[PDB]
Symmetry: C3
Amino acid sequence: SYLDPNYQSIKWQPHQQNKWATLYDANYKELPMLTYRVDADKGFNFSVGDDAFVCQKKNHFQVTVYIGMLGEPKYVKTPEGLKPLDCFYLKLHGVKLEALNQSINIEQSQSDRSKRPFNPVTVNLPPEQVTKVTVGRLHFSETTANNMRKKGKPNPDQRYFMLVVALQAHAQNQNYTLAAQISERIIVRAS
Amino acid sequence: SYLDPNYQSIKWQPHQQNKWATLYDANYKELPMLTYRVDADKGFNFSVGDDAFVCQKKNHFQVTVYIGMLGEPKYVKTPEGLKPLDCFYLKLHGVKLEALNQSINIEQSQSDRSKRPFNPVTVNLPPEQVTKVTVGRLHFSETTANNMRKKGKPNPDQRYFMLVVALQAHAQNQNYTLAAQISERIIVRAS
Amino acid sequence: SYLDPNYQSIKWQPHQQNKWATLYDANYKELPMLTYRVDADKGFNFSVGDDAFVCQKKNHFQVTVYIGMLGEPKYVKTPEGLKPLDCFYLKLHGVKLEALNQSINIEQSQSDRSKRPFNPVTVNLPPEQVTKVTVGRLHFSETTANNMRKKGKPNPDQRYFMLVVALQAHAQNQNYTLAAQISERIIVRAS
């Protein structure tokens, strides 16, 4: 029994907000914090029996990010001080719920069904605008462990992934997180 | 095709949270941060085909704000230091999604269909209480640009507004934001 | 008229976020902020006529908390500086909407219908994992005042509770909030 995805969508929370860098303008003043909203608009369905969102490893998912750039950024304020801004990246990856320090790579498919690692994508964020970034045809590179039901009940050792969607500033060969959300837990099934 | 508004309502995020002032009590101690929840409870309907909330410029909308005042505020901590608190204002305005520095004025109508600019309203926030503030009969002063469909598809240049709902402290002829939320994108149609 | 609880659930916001302590690791470095999600998954139903969630005092409710511990915590950074960490507690309590400084005790029932005060529960938070904590068979110790309808309309003096769900660190005989959410307003009826 699956809930209507027009009404039931993955919920997100800020991820590692105390570690984010911040953007500064040409006058060396911190900009008002950019607006940031993430939506996983394809590929996930809430399973009532599992009490969790489910996706199928081979059916692609899609994430849309709305990034509202307030002001005109010129610098990133890092732990090592201000640095000139080179570019922005959007980065997506999974983490294991039971081992949050272990990442699950994300792959992107093409029509010919070839798949490539999904590396961070360059995003241009013009000033005073929301930029909408849609990342489609995505797949987790692994299934979650212990998916099989036991006694018509969820596996007691059911494992999960959480999806991390992060906006990064690149400065002097280093990337710095500006904003990041992490999803609620997700089950990834093979068949 | 429109989603049920009892289940699908405008989502909000904190707006410019790094620029907010904070409230202090009579003993010069920062209060626990007030609770703040915004609900656009009339006038918006999610259009599946447009993948966005829609409203009609001439049908009024309504916003309800729940402000939970913890403690008894006496001062606002501004960038220029502590200042005695005079009053609180609730301020509502739109911004253009493609030009976030451009505001859309909000107007308020009466039964006789006259309309007036909606300026910030004085709100009394007694200590240790949630104050519910309902602002009704509202209208955007403009339609969004490029509303007309092209080939039975959304206009590729469809423009949007976002609604900003902010609680301000007034001190020494100056207003300071204490809490503010901004909505997801909204289409505003004429007919 | 009640909304489907598979689609309409209690919304939460961070509570007193400027007063939280933070966790540090063995190398005296602040950990990335833990992930924290609260769900009131049984006992609450949104009443359209009251424009609020309702529960029955004698039907128990249940809250599930997902706590994602990033890194390995060893110290709590308090206002009085770093202190070694002893244990973690999950604390739940109500507050009166019209008197936020007044708490509503929560009680927990057993099958034999005996009820005990629900005091904070010890939670073990192993590193690099989400710990799921489910707290069931709960009851508010009071009904909300002024529940009875007047003229087929909500009582104009209808009172409400808000639920607070807080993760605390215990250090040197003192508890420190690490993360806390507060619910939207709730009506608690007797019959």
